[PDB]
Amino acid sequence: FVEMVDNLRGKSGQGYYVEMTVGSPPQTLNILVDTGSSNFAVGAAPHPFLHRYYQRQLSSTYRDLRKGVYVPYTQGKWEGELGTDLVSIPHGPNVTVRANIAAITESDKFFINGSNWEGILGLAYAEIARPDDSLEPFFDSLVKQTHVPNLFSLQLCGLASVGGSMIIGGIDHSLYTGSLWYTPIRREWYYEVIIVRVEINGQDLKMDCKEYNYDKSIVDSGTTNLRLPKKVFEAAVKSIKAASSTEKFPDGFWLGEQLVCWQAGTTPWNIFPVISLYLMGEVTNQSFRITILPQQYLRPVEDDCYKFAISQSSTGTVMGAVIMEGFYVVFDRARKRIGFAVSACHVHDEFRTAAVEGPFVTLDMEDCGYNIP
Numbered sequence: 091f092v093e094m095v096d097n098l099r100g101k102s103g104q105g106y107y108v109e110m111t112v113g114s115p116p117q118t119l120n121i122l123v124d125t126g127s128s129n130f131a132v133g134a135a136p137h138p139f140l141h142r143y144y145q146r147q148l149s150s151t152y153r154d155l156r157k158g159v160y161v162p163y164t165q166g167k168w169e170g171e172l173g174t175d176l177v178s179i180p181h182g183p184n185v186t187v188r189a190n191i192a193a194i195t196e197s198d199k200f201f202i203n204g205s206n207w208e209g210i211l212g213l214a215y216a217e218i219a220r221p222d223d224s225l226e227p228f229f230d231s232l233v234k235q236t237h238v239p240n241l242f243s244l245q246l247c248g249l250a251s252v253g254g255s256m257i258i259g260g261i262d263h264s265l266y267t268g269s270l271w272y273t274p275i276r277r278e279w280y281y282e283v284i285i286v287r288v289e290i291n292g293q294d295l296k297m298d299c300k301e302y303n304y305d306k307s308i309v310d311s312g313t314t315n316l317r318l319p320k321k322v323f324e325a326a327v328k329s330i331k332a333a334s335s336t337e338k339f340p341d342g343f344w345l346g347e348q349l350v351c352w353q354a355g356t357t358p359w360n361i362f363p364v365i366s367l368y369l370m371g372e373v374t375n376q377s378f379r380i381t382i383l384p385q386q387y388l389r390p391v392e393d394d395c396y397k398f399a400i401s402q403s404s405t406g407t408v409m410g411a412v413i414m415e416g417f418y419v420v421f422d423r424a425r426k427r428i429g430f431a432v433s434a435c436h437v438h439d440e441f442r443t444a445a446v447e448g449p450f451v452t453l454d455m456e457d458c459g460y461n462i463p
C-alpha cells in the first residue's frame with residue numbers, strides 16, 4: 091500500500107482531496123473525500139470557482155443515463171445529469187471501474203472559491219445517495235467489479251497546506267501507533283456509531299448516554315469540527331471553561347467566532363483538558379476510549395492564534411476532521427465496523443499522550459442509541 095501513502099492533499103478548512111481520473115482518454119480531477127455522503131459528483135460546466143471540470147462529451151466511454159439529479163442542502167444545491175464512465179485513482183489500486191457519475195451543471199453553496207477540488211467522492215452507503223438508494227455508490231462499484239477488499243482507511247494529517255493517506259482496500263501499519271480498536275457501524279447509511287461515555291480530564295460528563303447520540307453520531311471527513319448535540323456541547327464547554335479559567339476568553343471564542351492568540355510558543359496547552367469519547371466495542375458490555383488532546387480541538391489559523399473547533403449541532407454528533415486528524419480510522423465495511431488507533435501524524439503535547447485504550451465494562455450500551463421513529 092506504499093503507493094497510496096500521502097495520496098491526500100488540502101488547504102486548512104477546505105477538506106482533503108484525492109486525485110482521480112474519469113473517462114477515455116482520462117480526465118484528471120481533484121476530488122473531496124467525504125465519508126458523510128454517497129454520491130460521486132463532479133463539476134461538469136465552467137463554474138468560476140473551478141480549476142477544471144469534467145467534459146463528458148470528450149469521453150468515448152461516457153454513457154448518459156438520461157436522468158437528472160438534484161441535491162438540496164441548507165438553501166444551496168447541486169444539480170446535474172447522471173451517467174456512467176470509467177474511473178481510476180492514480181495513487182490507489184491498479185484498477186478501473188465503471189461507476190455512476192453526477193455531472194454537476196448548476197450549483198449554489200457547494201464549490202469553494204479558492205479550493206483545489208472539483209468534485210466529491212461520497213464514501214457512505216446507498217441509503218443516503220441521491221436521487222435514491224438504487225444509485226450504486228462508487229466504493230460499492232469498486233468492490234463489486236474488482237478484487238479490492240471492502241474496506242478503506244484514512245489518515246488525515248493537519249492558507250497552510252494539508253496532507254494525508256487514503257488506503258483503499260487495506261490497512262497500512264506505518265500510519266498508526268498502539269492498538270486498533272473497533273466500534274460497530276450501527277447502521278449502513280452514514281458511518282453511524284454509538285458513544286457510550288464522555289470524560290473531560292477523566293471527569294465523567296454524567297449525562298444520559300442517549301444525549302451523546304441524539305439523534306445520531308457519525309464519522310465524517312466532510313466536516314471540519316467535532317460537532318456535539320446542544321445539551322452535550324453546553325456541558326462540554328462548561329467543563330473546558332472551568333479547566334481553563336485562569337485565562338479569560340471572549341464569549342465569541344467559545345462560539346468559534348473569534349480567535350485567541352498567544353506570543354509565539356507560549357500557548358498554555360496545559361490548561362486545556364483532554365476529552366475521552368468511549369465508543370461501543372465489538373464484544374457484549376465492552377467499550378473502548380479515544381482520547382483527544384487540546385491540539386486537536388484548537389485549530390491553528392494565521393503570534394500563535396487558534397479557533398475553537400468544537401461546535402453545537404442540532405443533527406447529532408459529528409466526528410469531523412478535527413477528531414480524525416488525531417487517529418488512523420479504518421472503515422471496515424466488510425465487517426460493519428470502524429477502527430481507531432492513534433495516528434502516526436497527530437500533533438503531540440509536551441507532557442500528555444493521545445490514546446486508544448480498552449477494554450472497559452459498559453452495561454446497557456444499546457440504550458445509548460437514539461431511535462429515530
Ligand SMILES: CC(C)(C)CCNC(=O)CCc1cc2cc(-c3ccccc3C#CCC3(NC(=O)c4ccc(F)cc4)CC3)ccc2nc1N
Nearest residue numbers: 103104105126127163166167168199200311312313314411
Ligand atoms: C444530505 C446530503 C446527502 C447532502 C449530505 C448528508 N451529510 C451531512 O449532512 C453531513 C455533512 C455533509 C454535508 C454535505 C453537503 C453537501 C452539499 C449538497 C448541496 C449543496 C452544498 C453542499 C455542501 C457542502 C459542504 C461540503 N464540505 C466541505 O466543503 C468541507 C469543508 C471542510 C472539511 F474539512 C471537509 C469538507 C462540500 C461538502 C454535499 C456533501 C456533504 N457531505 C457532508 N458530509
